[model samples]
Target: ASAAKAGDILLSHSFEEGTTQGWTARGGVKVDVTAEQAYQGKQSLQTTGRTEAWNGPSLSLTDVVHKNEVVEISGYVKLVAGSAPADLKFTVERRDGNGDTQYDQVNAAEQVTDQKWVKLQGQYSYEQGSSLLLYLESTDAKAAYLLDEFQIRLVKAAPENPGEAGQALFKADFEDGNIGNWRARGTEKLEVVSGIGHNSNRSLKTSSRSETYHGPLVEVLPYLQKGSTVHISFWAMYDEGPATQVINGSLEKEFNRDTANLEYAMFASTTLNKGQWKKIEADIIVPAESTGISGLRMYAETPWKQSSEVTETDTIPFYVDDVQITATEA
Candidate 1:
């Protein structure tokens, strides 16, 4: 088992001992510990026969924690079969020294349908010298719910190292099962596929169906600085092509404009089939003229020209993976 990190405290609210020891039930709610279902362990807390709004289980965290702390709240919830859908609310309230209370809440109504188990998680930054209360409530009348494995912990922010500057500016291996911070445009859908990555298990794949300009694009302003030298690298392979394909990496400003021009573009093209994964790298100097540029974009475009010999029937699938953009001060 992995050990807890520093400044971590496991909240004593798991309801595993078949009791609602530290929890309180309110407002037309009936709470019980049952072994019928649980997300973890042998038992879970069941809240049923609730008819009033904002009625459910709650806990107090004022004594266990101090002010200005980071708190993570997590638990699992499932609605009873045939029950009406309800808005499940997880809330954190902070009471300040002046007796004013502020709240942070997360609500789930769509996930409460279909009788499926869903995990709930949220994080909050504590206000100074404030008393805290955590609770779970439902907005619908006569709703039944199950909650298990509730946890709240204090999280310490990781300290940053000032020496590790100008490292990897942007990266998207897609290993997290997400295509975060990247987007696709034109012709076909850009998708994440399994068993196709150059190093990881996932890669971004798309097909070109005679589109003039189509592929994935990434916003580059967060990674590049003015007058910095950036090294961009990625892996790509074609599914079926000795067909004409243009793979280009370009740094451009004013990307939202229809006729935006490239500041620097390094591209390669070949008639030979490149079915095997190939690594491409290019370096570009962030020009002084880019100072007035509102936005910078780095993208790969695969343009296929159409004629009598080639049509949409000749659409070829392309796979791209392990994109890394690094920068150093020029």
Candidate 2:
């Protein structure tokens, strides 16, 4: 319910790339960039020979917003002079998990004119879908328009979930309905809950926490190499405490060398969307001074409130799933 904070740009095109940039005809229309109009750069994409209301410039978001994300999509649209004002909207045509075609209006259409430039903004979350596309549509057919500066952002969401386990050195998806390799931290209890996930069926949840640092964690020393770079990532969601809070996922490293060994907490973190899920990613390079390693762990929790002031919610519960790690020799 707050003003949209501009987030990481997923797709930005001014048609200055000279090519279509994968933007093409939604139907049987012709799409191309032209010098006839310039929103800012030297060119703007133009759609002509439209035969239907839904026919116009179209772009595939399958690679950009394939699965789940809170997204903001917008663009500047200008109809050809005297083409009659039209109600133009940006829409997402997607194929759901069931292989059924579905349509969701991204920027709800109202009124757009051929007089000047009109900017339309839409915010939506494509929670679940197999295929997705962002295309321009209008209530009036055959009204060709010019599009420029078309953009899409993640809107406080993760760049994108690393959906694939992809050669993970260590992976605990909990899809088998159990926390196989993970154990509880402190007195906190861990359970593999069903029906809640980053987008899957199962996730690992922690409760009965006594301190802010009490969360589920897994030992990672066995997967570490003395001379290598490690990638750590996981998906987490919280249901208690603040509506929006930061989730700290860190690699508590303890190499053989003492002076250079430190927890990789500085770069391992992400924000939680209350009851929604977000991905956390971090990378650390193991020092060459190390010969062998031990006592390394990876855990996600809400801390810092421990010394900030007196607060009892350090016992806030959280959920984690798809804890993945990979390492490459340096």
Candidate 3:
């Protein structure tokens, strides 16, 4: 899977779980996780059984992204150790129920070598779209390769007007050089560092985390009605193997965790480079089960549970930027 810096992110995926999150074999090819060599995480999706040069991994982008909404597709790829060198390219395959699919090359192809991660990125716009797909194909060799961190995100729109800058219901970009609405969950230290933001050049950095849930958090009950649904998104990166960002919402921020008032929004993990930022997103509903729900708090923590005995490796000194919460259904 992959992630982008700034935009109304539609999708960001990673293979830290070693599952085909949404990726499918494009042309009779097989893609599975291999522990042999990975670019970021412990494993990467390795494509094999490539009988044809055109066979590669593909993903659908029809629903999350749409026509004329220019998007940026970026990801990393590399060849299996000692395999034949190949020129790999990311392509856009489109179909309108026509005779055959149409293909458009995204940017230029990069030749990948043994065990070294190579970057592929290109801006795209679909003039027509009934079905759309993004795939990685080698132009020449049929040799199998490794794929990682594929991302598709919209290009950031021009800055909003000053009069309408406050349109978002909740936002915390830290563009003003301070931790906006978020506060440290426990005893961790949170700072807005300059020149490290995924959205701008400033992002909220978390440090001194001795617990799994000691990252940054924001309370949203003030901006949303009880029981209403809202979409939350932000970009994050870790300086420390791959980090897992557990996004959970507290039905009542003041309530103790016992599953009744706790909502597991999502768990997204990554193994990209230190500065490689990935976007995490989720739709959460402020619990209306009872009026006890005084707060719908959103938080980003590494391995966010079992606060005392963490089964997962714990080291997340990550940075977050461009946090936005929109009233999706409210």
Global Cα lDDT for candidate 1: 0.67
- Structural RMSD, model 1: 12.5
Q: Rank the candidates by lDDT, best first.
A: 2, 3, 1
On a 0 to 100 scale, what is the lDDT of residue 74 in model 1?
Answer: 77
Q: Pick the candidate with the highest lDDT.
A: 2
Error of 2 at 256 (Å): 60
lDDT of 2: 0.77
Cα lDDT tens digits, model 2, 1-330, are 223333778888889977988998888998999987867788988988998887888898888863446788888988876788888899889888798999998877857777788898998676578888888888788788888898888774433234343456777777557577788867889999999887778899998877777788888777766566788888989887776777788656665657465555544777667888888888776545444565677887775554556365556788998888876432
Candidate 1's clash total is: 0
Residues 1-330 of candidate 3: C-alpha lDDT, one tens digit per residue: 123234666676668886877888988888887777777778778888787777888888887566556788888888876687888888888875453678877879888887588998998876565888888888764778888877777874323211223236777767556566778878989999997877467888988878876778887777876777766677888765453344332322543334455644443444445558887776666667474655566777765557567643464687887877777642
| Candidate 3 segments exceeding 4 Å error | 1-6, 97-100, 156-330
Candidate lDDT (C-alpha), each: 0.67, 0.77, 0.71
Angstrom error of the Cα, residue 18, model 1: value is 8.5
lDDT of 1 by residue, 88-160 (tens): 7687667877878876674444357536778887776654546777778766767788888887776743211
Off by over 4 Å in 1: 1-166, 243-246, 255-264, 267-272, 287-290, 303-315
